[PDB]
Design an enzyme around this catalytic site. Structure first.
Site, PDB file in Angstrom:
ATOM      1  N   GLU A  86       0.930  -1.030   0.027  1.00 39.04           N
ATOM      2  CA  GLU A  86      -0.194  -0.149  -0.177  1.00 39.04           C
ATOM      3  C   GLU A  86       0.916   1.322   0.067  1.00 39.04           C
ATOM      4  O   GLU A  86       0.313   2.402  -0.109  1.00 39.04           O
ATOM      5  CB  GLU A  86      -0.994   0.068   1.255  1.00 39.04           C
ATOM      6  CG  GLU A  86      -0.276   0.096   2.522  1.00 39.04           C
ATOM      7  CD  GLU A  86      -1.182   0.091   3.682  1.00 39.04           C
ATOM      8  OE1 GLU A  86      -2.522  -0.124   3.333  1.00 39.04           O
ATOM      9  OE2 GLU A  86      -1.102   0.319   4.898  1.00 39.04           O
ATOM     10  N   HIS A  87       2.079   1.092   0.439  1.00 42.35           N
ATOM     11  CA  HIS A  87       2.821   2.213   0.212  1.00 42.35           C
ATOM     12  C   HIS A  87       3.374   2.644  -1.235  1.00 42.35           C
ATOM     13  O   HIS A  87       3.774   3.686  -1.773  1.00 42.35           O
ATOM     14  CB  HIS A  87       4.327   2.318   1.153  1.00 42.35           C
ATOM     15  CG  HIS A  87       3.914   2.454   2.625  1.00 42.35           C
ATOM     16  ND1 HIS A  87       4.835   3.223   3.339  1.00 42.35           N
ATOM     17  CD2 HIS A  87       2.744   2.706   3.291  1.00 42.35           C
ATOM     18  CE1 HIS A  87       4.116   3.693   4.547  1.00 42.35           C
ATOM     19  NE2 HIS A  87       2.910   3.175   4.490  1.00 42.35           N
ATOM     20  N   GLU A 107       7.968   5.941   9.981  1.00 41.96           N
ATOM     21  CA  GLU A 107       6.571   6.032  10.238  1.00 41.96           C
ATOM     22  C   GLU A 107       6.384   4.738  11.492  1.00 41.96           C
ATOM     23  O   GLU A 107       5.488   5.356  12.561  1.00 41.96           O
ATOM     24  CB  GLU A 107       5.733   5.553   9.145  1.00 41.96           C
ATOM     25  CG  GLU A 107       4.032   5.491   9.219  1.00 41.96           C
ATOM     26  CD  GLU A 107       3.553   5.930   7.963  1.00 41.96           C
ATOM     27  OE1 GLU A 107       3.839   6.864   7.206  1.00 41.96           O
ATOM     28  OE2 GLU A 107       2.429   4.922   7.922  1.00 41.96           O
TER      29      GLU A 107
END
Lengths: 78, 101, 420, 445
Positions: free
Chosen positions: D59-60, D136
């Protein structure tokens, strides 16, 4: 007259901060006291921001608006 | 009636709290709703009530009473705690009715 | 009448708008021009205490009755406050919209404002201000308005720390009696009958005076303040005056905001189309967030750049953003980018409208501002009617205008306004 | 014009199947915008501890370049059409979402198909996003609530693929390569576990034609018949205590085993969660709040906030309460929360049950107001129930819920059950497991 005390008449104790590290022989005028200043409330720590991808989206681009409610959290929108 | 006011004044003198400078709202017992009423009292009324109770405690410690001219009277016995106490009773009855529901 | 919006104006100045969409959830909003704008130096924070005092004992319903009844319905009661206006919104089932409207108008029109309640509530004011200032963008925007205007918009939206403990029920009653008047309110509703709405309008809102106090016209001042608080990132907003709500210049300023970048449309993206982000990322190797801040009001507007950066790179980020806007003002732009900005603005406005909460907010704001409905088709028509020459004119106006700067962080390398 | 009549007047969604088994569902409204998303039934529950961050990496990296549009060209097209783009991944699901206008639907569905089909994973972008994931993870470690929820998931589903977090461990993030990403794409991004959901100003016929044009060839077949399978994950009673006294507040989450997605006790347990309620310190209710736990929290000044959660996965779930409080109120808050839980378990009244039912009505309709949450509900419903449960069916379930069966279900799920406890911060005041269990049974009932 190359000094703050010899130049500023009534502003010498304002421009000069005097700290008596050791208690003197004579008492000082205007001893002063801290009248029990209040403490800010303890809140949850907001997250830091270390990467640009998670940094994006937090620069404000709209007027500030607040929202409170009877049973919904008080939010703020930027 | 005209007879009722005189009898009430005589009973009020027989009660004896006017002789120490109290009022009826001072002498009523401090329950939970009464405590809420005193909390809802304004600052000046709270201060006057606190001074009156303190002077009363001093007088009863000394086993004395106030002079005749300095006794409070029936006509100026203001009922300051009455509306606050009535509102606290009404709110508590509302909460009781909602608990009954 | 699901096909359109029923719209009426009472003789006392009240505005009634309704839409019967047969939604399962019915919404009733009351929009009043009683924000933080309408406070002088003597009653600051009264709007904040009113907003937090929207659940007190009232002439008709107690606070216990309001809370227990609304949460027994399960509907929501909320207050949304700007500088300009406050919005009292209630939502719930169509069967209980009657009692929800009774509670809403009982807590709006006739609050008692008992002094023990507000004495207990000023601590909640302090806590709410702390939670609002948990993040630094609120503080930056408040400081920005405070240094941008002399009065009527420099008033903080949250209560001052000294004013905590000083706001009185007399001041609250004075504010309500001077600003909660019929000619400056609008009662709008979704999933409700216009007959019921007007019936409760003359049943409650008929006994208020008129226009009330006007305001102070919000003269601009300029200047800058710098709060050094040692934070790991530096926030800096540099703005200038722009148009007010209801102008083609304001529409051009909003298009210019979306052209320079109003924020990300892609999660964890590079923001490849936003010119501010492109210009900053051309010569930076640090995390950053640059955007175009736009905020219009009834008589004045604020347009500028908001930069969040590192302490060392803050000057480079601010200078790159300012040079990008200077290039836009000089005329370095393409019509394709302007059309993309207009498409972004259209998509953002339509996504604001698509939610019933946002639709109700827009209906109430339009009713308070213009006193008439402007359809989204006509809004998109004027958005398309915005020209790029007006975008260049707005950029030139921001470049040539007097500057207001609010900065916070570790400002060893953050430049000053005269250095820009 | 009643509530049931309005729920009947709610439009019905439409579901169809492509030739490869991919599900295509749509709800048409009068909105000028649309939300089109792809939901993939894949996540940490299917990851096997060697590719523990593969979904997070995907998803990144799905938006950082494709085969047809390389690098930032998909971003340029998305900004040019003005669409908002989003993605997320929970332990069972991976969702991509596009909010756009009704006139850009073919471009939106082509971009979605190109993202979920032709995602080009360059190694330089892999390294850059790997650094982004490390930063993150540090940021999310600095976030208080996510740490506690991950700790609760681990200590509740230990030894199973449901214990591992969505982001995965940093060792797996650093050691993960491009071939693991291609293996995850070719193993988990299959046709029949994909739902193309559209909500808003969208026609189902046009959506089906566009899905036939774009998402026809997804290669539902397996590489060497390497078909995975759903395995049940045990629930365990346990606790994790990350004591770090320098932090200002303590976050404590206490949960028990849930019913699962397909269990009809979800409505009853959500009603019970509405009885318990939620509170934040900025709530304007005060002492007069209808929730007695929130009322006693205001009266005694115990917690900063609390909320009740019912997270459901395939035949399992975490169901409980999470609260942030100071270091001196954890024991009292645990006592009051368990007291409210077993007040619900033993003596539930029809008045409060009706209050919670009406709260659940308002919550469901307010959540389902909006094209993006309607699309999310469509995708999650087709992935979990196999069908979209209508609002009339939901309302019929709430009508079926009353006090007696709520009491029975609460006694089934809360009473005398070993819980999972996750504490972070100054949690010396937090009671022992034996004390928590002794609160998890009454001696008077």
């Amino acid at each position: 007259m190359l000094s703050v005390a010899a130049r500023s008449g009534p502003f010498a104790p304002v421009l000069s901060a005097t700290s008596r590290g050791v208690a003197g022989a004579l008492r000082p005028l205007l001893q002063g006291a801290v009248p029990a200043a209040s403490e800010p409330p303890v809140l949850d720590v907001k997250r830091p921001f270390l990467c640009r991808e998670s940094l994006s989206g937090q620069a404000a681009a709209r007027p500030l608006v607040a929202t409170v409610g009877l049973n919904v959290p008080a939010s703020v929108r930027f | 009636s005209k007879w009722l006011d005189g009898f009430r004044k005589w009973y009020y003198n027989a009660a004896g709290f006017n002789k120490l400078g109290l009022m009826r709202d001072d002498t009523l017992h401090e329950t939970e709703d009464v405590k809420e009423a005193i909390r809802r009292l304004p600052e000046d009324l709270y201060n006057d009530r606190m001074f009156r109770i303190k002077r009363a405690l001093d007088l009863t410690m000394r086993h004395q009473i106030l002079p005749k001219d300095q006794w409070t009277k029936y006509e100026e016995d203001k009922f300051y705690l009455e509306p606050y106490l009535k509102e606290v009773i009404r709110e508590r009855k509302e909460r009781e009715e909602w608990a009954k529901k | 009448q699901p096909q359109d919006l029923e719209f009426t104006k009472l003789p006392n100045g009240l505005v009634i708008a309704s839409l019967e969409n047969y939604a399962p959830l019915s919404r009733i909003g009351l929009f009043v021009k009683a924000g933080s704008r309408y406070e002088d130096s003597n009653n600051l924070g009264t709007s904040h205490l009113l907003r937090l005092a929207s659940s007190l004992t009232t002439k008709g319903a107690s606070s216990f009755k309001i809370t227990r009844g609304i949460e027994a319905v399960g509907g929501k009661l909320s207050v949304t406050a700007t500088r300009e206006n406050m919005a009292y919104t209630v939502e719930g089932i169509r069967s209980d919209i009657e009692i929800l409207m009774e509670f809403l108008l009982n807590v709006t029109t006739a609050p008692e404002f008992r002094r023990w309640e507000v004495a207990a509530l000023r601590s909640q004011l302090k806590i709410d201000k702390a939670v609002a200032f948990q993040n630094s963008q609120t503080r930056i925007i408040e400081n920005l308005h405070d240094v941008a205007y002399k009065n009527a918009l420099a008033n903080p939206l949250y209560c001052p720390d000294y004013r905590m403990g000083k706001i009185t029920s007399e001041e609250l009653h004075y504010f309500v009696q001077n600003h909660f008047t019929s000619a400056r309110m609008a009662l709008v509703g979704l999933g409700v009958s216009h007959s019921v709405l007007k019936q409760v309008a003359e049943q409650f809102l008929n006994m208020r005076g008129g226009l009330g106090l006007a305001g102070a016209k919000a003269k601009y001042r300029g200047g800058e303040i710098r709060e050094q608080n040692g934070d790991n990132l530096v926030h800096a907003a540099i703005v200038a005056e722009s148009a007010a709500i209801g102008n083609a210049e304001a529409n051009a300023f909003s298009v210019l905001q979306h052209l320079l970048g109003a924020g990300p449309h892609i999660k964890r993206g590079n923001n490849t189309t936003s010119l501010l982000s492109q210009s900053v990322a051309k010569g930076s190797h640090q995390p950053f967030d640059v955007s175009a801040f736009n905020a219009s009001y009834s008589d004045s507007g604020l347009f500028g750049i908001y930069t969040i950066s590192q302490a060392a790179a803050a000057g480079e980020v601010i200078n790159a953003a300012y040079n990008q806007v200077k290039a836009v003002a000089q005329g370095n732009l393409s019509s394709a980018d302007v059309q993309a900005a207009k498409n972004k603005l259209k998509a953002g406005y339509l996504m604001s409208v698509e939610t019933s909460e946002g639709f109700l907010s827009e209906i109430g704001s339009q009713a308070l501002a213009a006193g008439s409905y402007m359809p989204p088709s006509t809004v998109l028509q004027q958005i398309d009617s915005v020209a790029d020459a007006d975008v260049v004119k707005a950029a030139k106006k921001f470049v040539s205008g007097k500057k207001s700067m609010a900065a916070s962080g570790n400002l060893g390398h953050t430049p000053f306004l005269d250095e820009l | 014009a009643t509530f049931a009549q309005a729920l009947q007047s709610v439009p019905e969604t439409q579901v169809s199947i492509l030739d490869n088994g991919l599900r295509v569902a749509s709800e048409q409204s009068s909105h000028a915008t649309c939300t089109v998303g792809v939901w993939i039934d894949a996540g940490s529950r299917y990851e096997t501890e060697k590719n523990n961050g593969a979904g997070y990496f995907l998803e990144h990296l799905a938006f950082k370049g494709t085969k047809n549009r390389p690098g930032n060209a998909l971003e340029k097209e998305v900004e040019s059409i003005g669409a908002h783009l989003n993605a997320y991944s929970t332990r069972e699901h991976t969702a991509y979402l596009i909010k756009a206008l009704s006139k850009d639907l073919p471009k939106v569905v082509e971009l979605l198909a190109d993202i979920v089909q032709n995602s080009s994973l360059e190694d330089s972008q892999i390294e850059k996003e790997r650094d982004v994931i490390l930063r993150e993870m540090q940021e999310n470690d600095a976030s208080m609530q996510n740490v506690v929820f991950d700790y609760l998931h681990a200590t509740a589903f230990q030894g199973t693929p449901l214990a591992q977090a969505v982001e995965g461990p940093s060792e797996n993030v650093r050691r993960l390569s491009r071939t693991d990403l291609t293996d995850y794409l070719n193993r988990h991004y299959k046709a029949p576990r994909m739902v193309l959901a559209a909500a808003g100003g969208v026609e189902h016929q046009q959506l089906l034609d566009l899905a036939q044009k774009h998402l026809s060839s997804v290669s539902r077949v397996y590489e060497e018949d390497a078909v995975p399978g759903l395995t049940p994950c045990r629930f365990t009673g346990s606790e994790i205590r990350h004591r770090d006294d320098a932090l200002p507040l303590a976050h404590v989450a206490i949960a028990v085993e849930g019913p699962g997605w397909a269990n009809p006790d979800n409505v009853t347990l959500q009603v019970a969660n509405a009885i318990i309620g939620h509170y934040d310190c900025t709530y304007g209710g005060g002492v007069h709040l209808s929730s007695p736990l929130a009322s006693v929290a205001v009266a005694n000044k115990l917690c900063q906030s609390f909320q009740t959660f019912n997270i459901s996965y395939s035949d399992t779930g975490l169901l409980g309460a999470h609260f942030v409080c100071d270091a001196m109120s954890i024991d009292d808050m645990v006592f009051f929360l368990q007291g409210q839980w077993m007040r619900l378990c033993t003596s539930a009244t029809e008045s409060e049950v009706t209050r919670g039912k009406n709260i659940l009505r308002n919550a469901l309709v307010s959540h389902l107001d909006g094209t993006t949450p309607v699309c999310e509900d469509i995708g999650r419903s087709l992935l979990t129930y196999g069908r979209r449960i209508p609002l009339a069916e939901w309302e019929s379930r709430i009508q079926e819920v009353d006090a007696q069966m709520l009491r029975d279900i609460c006694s089934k799920y809360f009473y005398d059950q070993c819980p999972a406890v996750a504490g972070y911060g100054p949690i010396e005041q937090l009671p022992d497991y034996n004390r928590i269990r002794s609160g998890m049974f009454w001696l008077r009932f």
